[model samples]
Target: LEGCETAILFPMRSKKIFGSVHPVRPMRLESFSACIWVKATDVLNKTILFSYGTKRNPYEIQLYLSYQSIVFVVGGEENKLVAEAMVSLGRWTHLCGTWNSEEGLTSLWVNGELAATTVEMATGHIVPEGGILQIGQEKNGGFDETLAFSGRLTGFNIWDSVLSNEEIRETGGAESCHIRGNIVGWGVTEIQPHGGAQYV
Candidate 1:
C-alpha cells in the first residue's frame, strides 16, 4: 500500500504485492520458520507488521503480536495465548517463531527475550496452500505480489529449530550468522598466491 509521504517500495526485481481484500495462492506457508527484527515508527493504533493470508481466508495465519498479545490465526480462527506484554512500538524488537510438527508449539520472543508461548494442533502441515508473505497487510493473491511493509525490517533469518536466547543475540546486527561460515582467503605463497579454500 502506497501513501503520500509514507510509501513502501520494493527492490527493482522484487515481485511483491500488498493490501488486498481476498486471499491469493502461490505464497503459501507450507512449513517454515522465521526470525525478524522490526523497528516500528508509529504505534498509534494496533498495527499489523507482518501477516500471511487474510482473516477471511480460513487458511490465513498471522504472527503480529499487537494489542499486547501474542496472536495466531490458524485456519481463520483467532487464537490468543498470552496476556498483554510491553512491545515498544517505536523501538526495535526481535521477533522469532518456530513451527514443528513433532513439538506442536508456536513460540514468540521479543528483544532477545521470551515473551509468550502457545501450543496448537499442527493444523496446516504444508504452510498455507498459497498466500503472499506480507509485511503491512495480508496477501491479496499469487506470486510476484507483495504487501508493503510500513516499518523497517533488518537482519531477517529463518531457521528450522527453536533458537536459544544466546543464539538469537549472536545472530543480530551486521555480523550476522550469514557471514560466519567459510573463509574466503587465508594462506598465500610467492609462487602460488591463492590460498586453499576450506571450511572455517
Candidate 2:
C-alpha cells in the first residue's frame, strides 16, 4: 500500500479465500487502468490476484502470477492483451496495468516502471457490461480455486480510462484521491473478503 492505512490484505489460506468489490455499474469501459500492491508468501501455482468479467471472457481485467511472474491482461471474448514481468518474492511490490481502446494498446507497470506492452490488441472494443468483478481468485467456473492466489493484496484500484505513465507511478494504496480510479475508486471504496480472507 502507498503507506498502508486503507486496505484489506489477504494471506494464503489452507483452502481458498478471496476479496471482492461489486458495485452495480461500477465497471463499464472501453479502456481501463489498475494498480495494486502484492507480496507473495509463496509462488505455488498460477495465483489470480484479481479477476473481472465472466468465465469464458474475463479479459475485462485480470492480474495474476503465471510461472512466478506478474501478468496483466485486458480484453475479452477472443480479444486480449497481455504483458508480464518477474519480481522478487516475500516483499511488497506495486503493479499497474493500462488499456486504451482508441489505440488498441495495453501496458503493464511494475514498481512504477513500464514492464511490458501490446498494440492493436483489443482496439475499438468495449469491455462487456455488467459482469461480476472478483479479486483474490478467479471466478471462472464458479470460483475456481485452482488459480487461487497465495499472497497479500492491498491498495487495489481500477479506472475506466487509461492512466499515463506518470499517473501509474503515483498510484496504488487506498490512501488518497490524487489518482482516483473511476471504477474501483481507490481513495473512496471498500473491499469485502470471504471465507478465511482477513485484512492485514
Candidate 3:
C-alpha cells in the first residue's frame, strides 16, 4: 500500500539511510516556524528528525526527539528549547517549533499542544542562507547511527514567519497532509534520499 504522499521512511539505523532536502532558493528568516509528523520506531536518546546548517555554522536549526522530550534548536547548540513529555514511540505524533527574533521567544508544541517556550534562545539571530538541510541524521563532521531517526516523517514544513497557536493547531489536523511551506515544502519540495531511505 502507498503511504502518505509526502511521507518518507527511515526504516533502519544506518549512516547511509538519510535524506537531504534542497531549498529552492536562499532563505533568510528572522522569525520562523517548522513542523513535522513523525512515528518513531525506537526510543533513542537523540533521534534527529531534521537539521539545517551552513558551512560557517553547521547547527543553524535542527529538531530532534529525546528520550523524554523534543529539542528545538536555533543558531547553535547553546540555543535550544526542550519540551518535556512529548515523545510517543511507535505512534504518530506531530511536532512543531516557532520563534520570533524580536521577542527571542521560542516555543515547542506537540500535536498542537503547547509544550514550553523560552525567551533566551538565539533571540537576535537570523537563520542564514545557502545551507545543507538533512533529515534523519545530523551532519556532525561524520555520520552516526545513534543520531539517526528511525521512523516515518512527513508534512515537514517551514515558514518564514512564526505561526499562531491556532494555525499550528490546524497543522495537527488531517489538512496538514496537503499543506506546504513557503520556504521548504513537503510534497512540493525536492529531497534526496541516501542509503535506502525512501517514500513508501
Candidate 4:
C-alpha cells in the first residue's frame, strides 16, 4: 500500500469549476445505478455532488442535498424525486441509487439500506445524451457556489443496470475495490482538477 497521503483527493473551489470525462459513448440506459462516498460539509442546501446529463430539466440524473438531507433525482422530460434521507456532516457516507425498467421502480440507499424509492419515473426510457458524467461541479450544467462541493469524494462508480443489495454492500464505500475492468464495467474515469481544486 502506498499510504494515506497517497490516497488523499481534492476539495473543489466554488469560484473555479472542474470535472472528468468517461471513455465511452452514451448508450441507451433504460436502467442505471450509481455508487459513491462523500463527506459533506456543515453547510446545508448545497449540491454536494453531481453527475449524469447536462440540462436544467429532462436531464439524466442529479444528486444533491436539501436541508442537510440527501436527495436523488432522475428524469428526462420532467424530473422525479428520491428524497428524504439524512447524512452526517463532515463524515463519509455511502450513497447509491438505482432505477430499473421493471415496473419503473427506483430505489435509494444510504449506508446499505433502501431508504426511499418511487415508481414509473422515466421508466422504459433511455438516459439522454449530452452528458459528461461529471463530479464536483459542471461548467454549463447549472453549477454555482450553492452547488459547488466542499469535501472529499471517492469510490464513485456507475453501472448500466441496477445492482442487487448484496452487490452494493460489497462495493459501497470500499475505496480499493473498483469496477474499471472489462466491457460493461465502470471504466477508468478521468479526474481533471483545476483552479482551487487541489489534492490535499
Per-residue error for 72 in candidate 2, Å, reads: 1.7
Clashing pairs in 3: 16-195
> Who is ahead in lDDT, 1 or 2?
2
TM-score of 1: 0.58
- Pitting candidate 2 against candidate 3, the one with the higher lDDT is 3
Q: Identify the runs in model 1 with alpha carbons over 4 angstroms from their true place.
A: 1-31, 44-46, 54-59, 70-75, 121-124, 141-149, 177-200
Query: Global lDDT of each model?
Result: 0.43, 0.70, 0.84, 0.63
Q: Best-fitting candidate, measured by lDDT? A: 3
Candidate 1 lDDT over residue span 1-200, tens digit each:
11111222222212333332122223344344456556654432334445655334633545554544645443444543342565565576666655554445666666656666667646445454444444444444343322233445444444434456676656554445342211110111011101121111
lDDT of 4 by residue, 1-200 (tens): 22123212445446565556463646456777877777866445656465666545434776766673677777652655645777887888878888887667888888888888888876676776655566666446334666677777766666778888987777664533554312123335545555456455
Model 1: per-residue Cα lDDT at residue 113: 66
TM for candidate 2 is: 0.84
Off by over 4 Å in 4: 1-13, 25-27, 55-58, 138-142, 173-176, 179-187
Q: Please give the lDDT score at residue 4 for candidate 1.
A: 12
Instruction: Tell me the tens digit of each residue's lDDT in model 3 across 29-75.
Output: 89989899899998587889989988888889889988888899999
What value of lDDT does candidate 2 attain over all alpha carbons? 0.70
Candidate 4 lDDT (Cα, whole model)?
Answer: 0.63
